[PDB]
């Protein structure tokens, strides 16, 4: 009874952009990962610190679900120890990551015949992100020595750039929906685990 609400995460009407990813807490419920794993709709179902068939037995304190939309060719960057624009300035995973990553193609939903420009990513940032850190600042990025006072120009850029999702794009530049599950087992009594 009181099954975990996994339908409100995977089947959400709209997703978030990668620079402003969505985080959801799962607790006080029973989780059935068999339906998630046996589905044939997922292009990527990869996980590292747990055995994919043993999720139904392990019991954790709580679960985190982080969801966003990225480019098809950047799914390889959502993994421990990776480097790139997404891994360095948008979404960083720890090297001792536990949990796992699910990703599927959503070209029919996130592409528009004239081009979809509602999805953004950060391109300019002074330093790398700490694991599980979010940054939604939209201040003008200074790339030179002369400080601009909030007006865009030659060496002062808006740090967010839009994807160009379009239905005729080749596989590699088509949108992909990504959900990352993180399992926390703390000193508190375990709460999330299946039958």
């Amino acid at each position: 009874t009181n099954l975990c609400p996994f339908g409100e995460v995977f089947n959400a009407t709209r997703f978030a952009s990668v620079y402003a990813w969505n985080r959801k807490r799962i607790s006080n419920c029973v989780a059935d990962y068999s339906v998630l794993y046996n589905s044939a709709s997922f292009s990527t179902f990869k996980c590292y610190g747990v055995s994919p068939t043993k999720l139904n037995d392990l019991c954790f304190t709580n679960v985190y679900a982080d969801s966003f939309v990225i480019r098809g060719d950047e799914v390889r960057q959502i993994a421990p120890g990776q480097t790139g624009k997404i891994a360095d300035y948008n979404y960083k995973l720890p090297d001792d990551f536990t949990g796992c990553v699910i990703a599927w193609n959503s070209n029919n939903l996130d592409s528009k015949v004239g081009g979809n420009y509602n999805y953004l990513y950060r391109l300019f940032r002074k330093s790398n992100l700490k694991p599980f850190e979010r940054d939604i600042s939209t201040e003008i990025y200074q790339a030179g020595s002369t400080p601009c006072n909030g007006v865009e120009g030659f060496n002062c850029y808006f740090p967010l750039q839009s994807y160009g999702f379009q239905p005729t794009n080749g596989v590699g530049y088509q949108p992909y929906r990504v959900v990352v599950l993180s399992f926390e087992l703390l000193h508190a009594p375990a709460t999330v685990c299946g039958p």
Partner: antibody
Amino acid sequence: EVQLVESGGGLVQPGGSLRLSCAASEITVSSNYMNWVRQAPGKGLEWVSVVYPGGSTFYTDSVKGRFTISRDNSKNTLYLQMNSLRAEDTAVYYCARESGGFPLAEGAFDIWGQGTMVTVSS
Amino acid sequence: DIQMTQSPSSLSASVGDRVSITCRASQSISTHLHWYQQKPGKAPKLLISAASTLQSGVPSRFSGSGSGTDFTLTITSLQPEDFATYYCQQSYSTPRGLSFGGGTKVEIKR
């Protein structure tokens, strides 16, 4: 006064080592995507290496394990250390800035240096 | 491993003529293509970005078009100083796939 100046090219024996420097003016090396690009005599352009604003570095397959790209914030300089040089590395090397321009040309090199010549021969 | 082919290899034209150069990719690259101009003994100069956007400080006679797997650069009136070599460069392959084209050279007709 946006400017890039290269230095350090020359003639080395096969298996030798070299160090190239790129001094920048009016642009901050630690804040931009900085690339090294080489051109062989009479041939086309070829990408060599890149360093990110946050510190990540990438190399092409031909030079991986032999070249190292570095920065210096006190002197505002870029460095390329080349080891185990071979005759195929004889070229003109350019220090370039990526993703600039007034309309923000992403993925394009808008500022280039003069280039320096590296000859590897015995 | 995307390779770009430029046509033609060389092109002869006179002053005041209209010139077109084509760049073709082995697979669709959307609009991630840029056009550079290089004169002998000098570094390349960026002319066109995103296959359609003119850069500031570039004469308005230069124009670019195309998408998918075919792209074109057009010069309407050819001034005497436009005799150089032109390159097309793609920025589609994400991590380490940056590559240039072969290049097209323009010379004076007689």
